Design a protein around this nucleic acid. Structure first.
Lengths: 336, 312, 129, 315, 278
RNA sequence: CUUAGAAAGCAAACCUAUAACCGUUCACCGCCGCACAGGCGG
C-alpha cells in the first residue's frame, strides 16, 4: 500500500534541545537558536523525514490525539495500532530544497551592551545633588590619586559631568585597563580595603589585582565616608547598596536600567544564520533549509489491511496538516 | 462513525505587487570578469543555489555562479510564508513575548490565540495554528540584475548591487483546519495544554471565548462549551481531554474573520509592496483534501452544510 | 607618430626652407600617392606631370568678414553656407599646423598627368617628373 | 482596540517625459556581430533583461551571451530605478547624512530627509523607514538602439566603445505614502525602531523643532507634533508601547503635500539625458488594499475627503 | 533658502544639410553594409538560430526612414562645437564641455545638454541620403555652469589645488571670461567653503563662483557657437539655420518643448545663485 | 500530532563624469574687393 503525501514550504530545521519523544518539561525545552548558540557545537540542526516523522503522520491521519511517543508507549489506550506495522513501512522522499534566512523568535534573554529602552534619566537625584559631584568624582581620579584617597584623603576635586552614559563609559575604560602586580605600596591599600571590606578578596588566580575592583570599592568608601556630610539615601538602594556597581566590579545592564525609564532591552530574535570559516572554501554560511515536493510512504500489507487502513482514514476525517514543521501537506493519492 | 460536514476551508490566493518585499541577503557570487564580488544581495528564490561545480581536491573550493546567471522560471521569486504570517498578524507581533501563565487568559481570547497559535515562554503551554499557508510564488518573473552606487564616492565599498523585480503576481494555497480551530485543549495529558487550569475555570474561559467570538459578528450566535472529557469522533481511541468546543456559529465567525484578513492583506516592505488581489474559497466536505489544488471545478464557494464536529 | 602628423610637420619644415631661402625653381612630387597623402616625397630641382595647390574662395572667416563689411543679408548668410559646405574636395590634403596666425588649416593639392614655384614647391604651370 | 478608519495611504500615478537614458546599469559582457564577444558595451537599466541566451554546449559549462543588438524594448523596457529617483528628489541634502552623529541627529529628523526619505546612522544604528514608495519609471516609447562611439585621434585599441541609447522617452509610474509610517516617529530602542536616543526632557524639545519645520511648509496650517512616553500601536492585546512623536492630521497634510509638490516638479539632468514629471494623478485611499488607483481608476478620490488614519494612541 | 531667477537656458535648433554626417559602424546583414545612425533601428529580425540563441539578420534594403529616422548624435555635435591642467579650465572646453583626466580623480560635468539632431525629411535609399532637415533641443544648466568645484569632498574636484593657488586660478578664469566680451564685468571668486542652497548642515566645498555677468558671457559664447555650428564630412554636411531661445525662470525644464507661448527670448531677470559662501 | 507549539533579514544608498566610427582629430584666422567675383599671406 502506497500513500503519497504532497507538501510545500516545510521547515527542515530544529532549534530545541532535549527531544520531542518524551514529555515536555515544566519550564519547556531549552532554546538553542540565538546568535551565540548556533556558533557552538552541533546546535545547528538540519532535519530530514525520518521514520518518526512518517509514523506521527500515519497516526495523525487516523485521528490519534496523543503524542507519538505516547502511542508508542501504549500510554492511554490498550494497544498501539502500528506496533506490528512499524517494521513494515518504507518511504521515499522527493524534496526540492531551498536555502533562505528566516528571522526566528527568541523567548527569554535581553541585551546589555548598547541596549536600553525609554529615556535616559539624566535628572536623577544621584547626579543632581550636592553630594553628587565629589561622590562620582572618585571614578575620575587616576590610579595614583585613588590610592592616596583610599588612605583617608578627603580631597576629591576631580570634576566630571554627572550622567549615566559618561559614568558607564568611564567604568568601561577603567574595566579595560591591564592588571597590576602586588606591590608593597599597594599591599597597604589592600589592608585598608580588606579592613573596610573583609568578606571579599581583591585577587585573581595568580596574585593579580584588577583596577576596576579598586575604583568600585573606593566608591563604596566615598559612600560610607560622605554619610557624615550629607544624606546619601538617594545614592543607595534600600539596604545600602549601589545600583549596578558591586565592590568587585559593575553590572552594566543593571546600571543602565536603573537610570533609564523603561525596562531592559529584549532580544526579540535573530536570523537563522551560521558563518564558519572552513579551510579551502573560505567563509561558508549556513541558513534554514525549506523543502517542497512529495513523500511516498509504502506499507507492505495484505490488501485487506490496506482497505482497513484507507477507511480508518476516512473515519477520522483529517485534512491539510503541516509536515515536520509549518508546511502545507495533504494526501494526494492512495494505492491499495 | 464517519465524521461529516466541512472538514477544512481551502483557498487559492492571487496577490499583486511591485519589487521584492522579502529579501534573502548578500550572497557570494562572481561577476562578468571572474573576480568574486562580496555584496550582491539576492531575494528569496525557489530552489536556487549559488554553486556550479567543484574544484581540485586539494582546495575543496566550490565554484560560484555569476550574479547574472538565474532563471526565474526554474528558480522563481517568492515571499516566504514566514513573512506572510508576520504581516497577517503584524499588530500582535510582540505580544507573545509578554504572554505568561497569569495573563494567558487574554492571549487566548484574541485572533492570535485562536488563529495564529502561540507559545508561552518558560512554559509547556502551546496552541498549533489551524491556518496553513504556502509560499507566495511569483508568476511573472520580471527580475534582472540591478547595479547600485553612492553619490560622492568612487571606492569599491561605495558600490553594491541586487537582483530586483518589477511587477509581480504571486499565487498561493492555504487551508483552515476545523479540527485545530474548533477545539481548545486545556489538559496536559497530550501536551496540548493551551493553558494551565484550576477546577471551575473551564466555564469562565468559555464565556470570554464566547464574548470575543460574539464581538466578531454580533449578528451570529456563537457557543463555547467546556467539558471535562472531550473525545475525538472517528478514532479507535477512548481517551479524551478537558477542553472547549465552539459550536457551528463560532466556527463560522473565525473562518470568516481569517478569510477577511487574507482578503485585505497587504505588505509594504523593502521599498516594495504587495496586496491580495483575488481569493478563491472551497468549503471542502469531500474526502479528498486540497480539492481546490488538483481540481478547481469541484469547488463550493458558499458554506453549503454544517462544519464537521470532531469531538463529543 | 603616424603617417598623418609627420607629413604636416615636414611640409611646414619644407615651407620655411624656401622662404628664408626664397627659391622659385624647387618643386614637389608624390609617387606612392593615391586617394591620400603620399608616403615618399620627391623634391625636384637642385615622368612628365605637374602638381598644384588648391583652395576655396569661401571660408567661415570670409563670411564673418562680409557680415562685418555690411555686404550680407540674413538670407545671404544662408545661401553662402549652402555653397561652401556643398563643395567637397576629394583631393589629397594636409592639416598644416602653424604659429604665425595660430591656426590649424587644411591645404589641398591637385594634379594633371600624361604629357615659377610658390612658397610650397607647387605651381600652376611648372612641370615635374 | 477599535478598527482603524480614515485615509490609510496616498497613492498616485506619475507621467514623465524626457530624452536619452538618465540612469545606467553599467558594462555588460555581450557578443557582437561576427559572434565574437565585446568587453565594454554599457547597458541602461532594462526591466527583466538578462544577457544570457540560456544555451550551453557539450560539457563546457559556458553560457551563451546574447548579441549586443538583441533587445526587445517592449518585453524588457527601459526604466529609472527608485534609487536614482529618490536621490534626485532629495538632491539638496544628498550628502548631509554622512555628517550625522549622536549630537546633531536632532536636525536630521526635522527635515524632508528625516521625515519622508529614510536614514540609517552606522555609528549608532538609529534609523527611520521611508513612508514613500516609488515603482519603476517605465518607458513607454522604446526608442532604443545600438549606438557605436569613437575617440578623437586616438585611433588605437580600445578607442571605440558602444552603448544602447535612447531618444524620446515617456515614463509612467505609481507610488504611495504610508500614513502609518509617516505619522509616527519612534524614539525608543524597545522595538529596534529608535529614530534617535533621547534624554528625559529631550522628547518634547525634538517635537517642537519637528512642528516648527512642518509649520514652515504651509504657514496657513496648524501642525502639531506631540511627544508621549508610551505610544501604543492599535491592535495589540497587552498594549505595550514606546517613546515617540505622533503628528496630528494637519502635520500629515503638510508633509503629504510637500512631497507631492516636490514630485510634481521633479526633473533629472544626468548622463547627458533628462526627464521631467509632466502630469500627476493622486488618490487618497481609505480602503485597506492599497494601489486602488492601479487596478480601478474610477474609484480614486483626488481630494482629501476624510481625516487621516490614527494608528497609535497614548497611554 | 528658495532659489529664484533663471534656472536654465533652453533652445530649439533647426539645421539644414545633405547626405549623412554621422555614421554608426560596420554591420552584418548578409555582407558588410555600413549603416548611418538611425533612432530605434535594429538589424535583427524575429528569427532564431538552432543550438544558439542568436538571431538572423535583416536585409540592407529593409529600413523605414520614417520609423527609424536619421539623427546626428550628441557626441558628434559636441565634437564639432568645441573643436580644439591649469589651462584646460578657463577655456570653452573646461567650462561648457566636461572632462575627466585619467590617473587622477579630477573631473567636471558639462552644463550643456543636447538631444539628437533628428532628420525630418526621410530621403534615403552604401545607403546614402539626400537633402536633410534636422530638429533638436538643448539646455544649459546654470547650477552646473556657475560653480567650479576644487574640492575632493564629494568627488567633484575639477583640479587638485594647494593653498594659495585658489585666487590665482579664479583670476585666470575671470580673464578668459573677460576676453569673450570686454563690455561686461565678469567675476570669478574663490572661497574655501561654498555651500549649496537646501542642505541641513551647510557642508561646503572650496571652489570658484562666477557672477551674473560671467555666466552671461559664457552663455552668449555657447549660443554663439551653436548658431554658427556647421559640420563638413566626406558623405554629407549640415549647418544651423535658426535657433530659438528661452530663458527659463520656471522649475520644470524644456518649457519651450511643451508650450512655445510661455518662453522669453531675452534675459528678463538675474540668473539663479545656487551657491553661497559660508 | 511529525523537526513539541509561535517565528520580518529587516532599515538607508546616483554606475557616476569625459569620448567625430572615422578620407590624415582639424574646410582654420586674417587681408584686397560691391561681390553668395577672383585671389593673396601662414
Amino acid at each position: 500500500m502506497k500513500i503519497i503525501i504532497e507538501y510545500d514550504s516545510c521547515w527542515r530545521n530544529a532549534f530545541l534541545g532535549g527531544s520531542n519523544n518524551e514529555p515536555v518539561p515544566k519550564k519547556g525545552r531549552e532554546f538553542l537558536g540565538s546568535m551565540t548558540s548556533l556558533k557552538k557545537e552541533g546546535n545547528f540542526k538540519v532535519c530530514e523525514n525520518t521514520l518518526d516523522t512518517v509514523m506521527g503522520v500515519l497516526n495523525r491521519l487516523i485521528g490519534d490525539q496523543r503524542k507519538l511517543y505516547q502511542a508508542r508507549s501504549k500510554m492511554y489506550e490498550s494497544a498501539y495500532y502500528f506496533e506490528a506495522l512499524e517494521d513494515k513501512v518504507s518511504f521515499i522522499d522527493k524534496p526540492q530544497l531551498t536555502n533562505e534566512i528566516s528571522f526566528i523568535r527568541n523567548m527569554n534573554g535581553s541585551t546589555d551592551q548598547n541596549a536600553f529602552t525609554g529615556m535616559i534619566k539624566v535628572s536623577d537625584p544621584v547626579f543632581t545633588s550636592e553630594y553628587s559631584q565629589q561622590f562620582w568624582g572618585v571614578l575620575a581620579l587616576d590610579f595614583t590619586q585613588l590610592c592616596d584617597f583610599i588612605i583617608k584623603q578627603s580631597q576629591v576635586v576631580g570634576s566630571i559631568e554627572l550622567n549615566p552614559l559618561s559614568i558607564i563609559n568611564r567604568l568601561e575604560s577603567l574595566n579595560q585597563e591591564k592588571a597590576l602586580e602586588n606591590s608593597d605600596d599597594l599591599a597597604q591599600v589592600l589592608k585598608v580595603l580588606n579592613e573596610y571590606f573583609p568578606d571579599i578578596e581583591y585577587l585573581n588566580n595568580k596574585g593579580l589585582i584588577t583596577p576596576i575592583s579598586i575604583y568600585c570599592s573606593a566608591l563604596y568608601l566615598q559612600l560610607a565616608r560622605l554619610e557624615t556630610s550629607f544624606n546619601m539615601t538617594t545614592a543607595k538602594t534600600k539596604a545600602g547598596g549601589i545600583s549596578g556597581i558591586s565592590k568587585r566590579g559593575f553590572t552594566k545592564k543593571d546600571f543602565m536600567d536603573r537610570y533609564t525609564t523603561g525596562p531592559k532591552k529584549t532580544i526579540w530574535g535573530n536570523p537563522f544564520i551560521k558563518k564558519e570559516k572552513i579551510k579551502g572554501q573560505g567563509e561558508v554560511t549556513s541558513m534554514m533549509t525549506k523543502a517542497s515536493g512529495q513523500l511516498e510512504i509504502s506499507i507492505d500489507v495484505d490488501r485487506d489491511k490496506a482497505q482497513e487502513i484507507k477507511i480508518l482514514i476516512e473515519n477520522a476525517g483529517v485534512s491539510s496538516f503541516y509536515l515536520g514543521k509549518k508546511g502545507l501537506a495533504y494526501v494526494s493519492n492512495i494505492k491499495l | 462513525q464517519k465524521v461529516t460536514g466541512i472538514k477544512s476551508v481551502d483557498f487559492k490566493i492571487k496577490a499583486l505587487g511591485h519589487g521584492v518585499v522579502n529579501w534573502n541577503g548578500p550572497t557570494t557570487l562572481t561577476g562578468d570578469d571572474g573576480k568574486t564580488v562580496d555584496n550582491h544581495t539576492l531575494p528569496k528564490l525557489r530552489g536556487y543555489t549559488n554553486l556550479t561545480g567543484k574544484v581540485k581536491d586539494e582546495t575543496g573550493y566550490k565554484y560560484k555562479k555569476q550574479a547574472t546567471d538565474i532563471n526565474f522560471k526554474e528558480t522563481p521569486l517568492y515571499i516566504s510564508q514566514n513573512c506572510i504570517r508576520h504581516h497577517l498578524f503584524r499588530e500582535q507581533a510582540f505580544d507573545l513575548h509578554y504572554a505568561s501563565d497569569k495573563n494567558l487568559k487574554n492571549v487566548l481570547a484574541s485572533i492570535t490565540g485562536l488563529i495564529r497559535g502561540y507559545v508561552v515562554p518558560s512554559s509547556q503551554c502551546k496552541r498549533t495554528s489551524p491556518l496553513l499557508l504556502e509560499d507566495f510564488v511569483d508568476q511573472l518573473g520580471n527580475g534582472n540584475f540591478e547595479q547600485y552606487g553612492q553619490a560622492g564616492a568612487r571606492d569599491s565599498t561605495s558600490f553594491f548591487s541586487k537582483t530586483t523585480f518589477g511587477d509581480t503576481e504571486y499565487i498561493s494555497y492555504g487551508s483552515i483546519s476545523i479540527e485545530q480551530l474548533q477545539f481548545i485543549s486545556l489538559d496536559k495529558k497530550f501536551d496540548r495544554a493551551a493553558m494551565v487550569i484550576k477546577e471551575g475555570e473551564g466555564e469562565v474561559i468559555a464565556a470570554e471565548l464566547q464574548n470575543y467570538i460574539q464581538s466578531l459578528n454580533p449578528s451570529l450566535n456563537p457557543q463555547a462549551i467546556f467539558h471535562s472529557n472531550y473525545v475525538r469522533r472517528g478514532t479507535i481511541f477512548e481517551e479524551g481531554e478537558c477542553g472547549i468546543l465552539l459550536n457551528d456559529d463560532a466556527v463560522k465567525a473565525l473562518v470568516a474573520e481569517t478569510l477577511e484578513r487574507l482578503a485585505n492583506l497587504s505588505i509594504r516592505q523593502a521599498k516594495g509592496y504587495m496586496y491580495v488581489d483575488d481569493i478563491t474559497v472551497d468549503y471542502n466536505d469531500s474526502h479528498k483534501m486540497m480539492r481546490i489544488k488538483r481540481d478547481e471545478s469541484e469547488i463550493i464557494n458558499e458554506q453549503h452544510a454544517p462544519f464537521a464536529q470532531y469531538f463529543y | 607618430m603616424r603617417e598623418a602628423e609627420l607629413s604636416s610637420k615636414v611640409f611646414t619644415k619644407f615651407h620655411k626652407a624656401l622662404v628664408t631661402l626664397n627659391s622659385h625653381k624647387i618643386g614637389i612630387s608624390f609617387p606612392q600617392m593615391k586617394l591620400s597623402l603620399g608616403q615618399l616625397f620627391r623634391i625636384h630641382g637642385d615622368q612628365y606631370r605637374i602638381v598644384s595647390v588648391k583652395r576655396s574662395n569661401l571660408s567661415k572667416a570670409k563670411l564673418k568678414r562680409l557680415i562685418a563689411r555690411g555686404s550680407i543679408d540674413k538670407d545671404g548668410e544662408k545661401r553662402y553656407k549652402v555653397k561652401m559646405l556643398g563643395q567637397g574636395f576629394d583631393n589629397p590634403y594636409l592639416d598644416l599646423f602653424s604659429s604665425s596666425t595660430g591656426q590649424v588649416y587644411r591645404k589641398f593639392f591637385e594634379f594633371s598627368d600624361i604629357q615659377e614655384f610658390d612658397s610650397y614647391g607647387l605651381s600652376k604651370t611648372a612641370t615635374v617628373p
